[PDB]
Ligand SMILES: CC(C)(C(=O)N1C[C@@H]2C[C@H]1c1ccccc1O2)C(F)F
Ligand SMILES: CC(C)(C(=O)N1C[C@@H]2C[C@H]1c1ccccc1O2)C(F)F
């Protein structure tokens with residue numbers, strides 16, 4: 001069941017850099033709060049938002065970010081989630097203290113475990129990227145869906161005329177070429193395997209791909225016609241097997257890519273023998 | 277789909293099996309004898325059902341041999357054997373490894389319950405261990421697979437149980453197992469992990485012990501002469517409650533136990 005929380009239960013809410021904000025619950029401590037809508041009171045979709053909140057609460061796994069509660073009040077709808085101290089994956093990869101190969105290896109296997117969990121329950125992420133991989137103080141990771149790609153009613157609630165905190169309209173580096181300039185195409189398990197491929201590269205590069213691209217359409221068309229992250233831009237020691245894995249996972253044809261159980265079967269013994 | 281394998285694909289009853297292209301496996305050969313032709317369709321459909329369970333903490337069925345007079349399940353190799361065999365070795369298992377063994381057991385049982393499977397026979401013999409001390413839950417007695425289990429116990433075929441069983445099933449074979457039946461087994465598996473031996477060694481009859489267990493008696497916590505933490509003793513007492521409804525679920529165990537493992541034991 002979903003825990004129904006109140007705004008009075010939280011003392012202060014400091015907006016943090018990437019509205020997502022750090023929130024101190026008065027009895028249960030530090031949490032993250034995605035406040036999705038703030039505005040005038042319209043109680044139209046509350047049944048579907050709560051049922052969608054129930055569905056996202058059913059997804060329980062050690063490598064998936066738990067929804068802890070929801071604030072469903074007059075003119076404010078928030079999601080409340082667990083706190084992951086080191087922030088997102090790209091924030092950790094850019095830090096002054098460098099992350100060793102064993103921790104990187106463990107990060108990749110935890111990513112695989114979490115994606116396997118979600119695919120096992122029929123969920124396609126549709127938006128796997130470093131920003132959606134959150135890291136605790138022991139370097140263990142949890143996958144989030146901060147763009148609300150799996151949850152239509154909460155995502156549509158953001159894009160509304162009444163909303164003061166409206167999204168006026170990063171993702172495209174990790175979006176599979178079949179989806180670039182193709183809004184109608186249905187994402188699959190294979191779409192996420194592409195994103196993962198680009199996440200692997202990023203883990204060994206310590207940065208976002210495609211730094212030298214100038215315009216958006218230049219990049220879109222480049223990626224659709226075969227261009228990938230530059231493998232020679234990996235300065236530090238990435239093993240041969242992980243480079244082979246990312247090239248396999250960023251195949252142009254979806255059916256040429258492996259699935260996440262197939263990745264895990266290959267990767268886990270490699271992690272244990274070579275990296276741990 | 278299930279991979280249909282051949283005897284010619286292997287070089288050799290439970291035995292070590294070398295697949296000619298894929299290396300070492302275990303082959304549980306359930307039947308060897310004359311040709312039983314009728315229920316090969318049900319055996320293959322039951323083989324398909326056991327093939328749907330893919331998880332790092334569950335033994336994968338790699339294939340099945342369904343041939344003239346010979347029926348075998350082929351599964352992954354686990355070098356150190358069952359959990360009880362590893363707990364009895366001359367080199368002791370440290371507390372951190374034991375903690376990780378418990379978490380892997382929890383992960384696997386949560387996987388299985390997530391796919392609607394009740395194990396119904398969780399015990400150290402069904403927990404296999406690899407050379408790095410990582411574990412996988414097995415169903416070596418085919419408790420979830422009636423046609424394959426009945427195929428073993430057949431007239432033509434030429435080829436300790438009670439200690440982990442919840443009291444609701446002792447002297448009540450008709451009662452339906454639940455997720456909570458496995459939670460009791462796990463509770464007794466925890467005890468065993470810190471004792472390095474089977475429970476109830478000093479009991480002298482089956483019927484005495486069964487009725488004792490049904491009326492609340494449990495494995496002896498004073499028999500633990502290693503450091504078992506306080507909160508794991510609290511966890512096993514919670515998990516071996518007489519009333520099934522009083523027991524936690526495996527997601528409930530994990531929520532408590534994982535952060536305990538991470539902060540205190542890792
Ligand atoms: C609460 C939110 C949506 C969240 O991370 N999740 C909800 C559930 C588990 C987790 C999640 C991760 C990835 C895909 C689906 C999904 O669904 C958060 F991002 F606000
Ligand atoms: C092949 C056998 C039966 C096996 O362990 N399993 C089959 C599938 C996954 C795994 C398993 C474990 C536990 C319960 C059911 C189950 O069903 C092996 F013991 F021979």
Ligand SMILES: [Cl-]
Nearest residue numbers: 062530531534
């Ligand atoms: Cl957890």
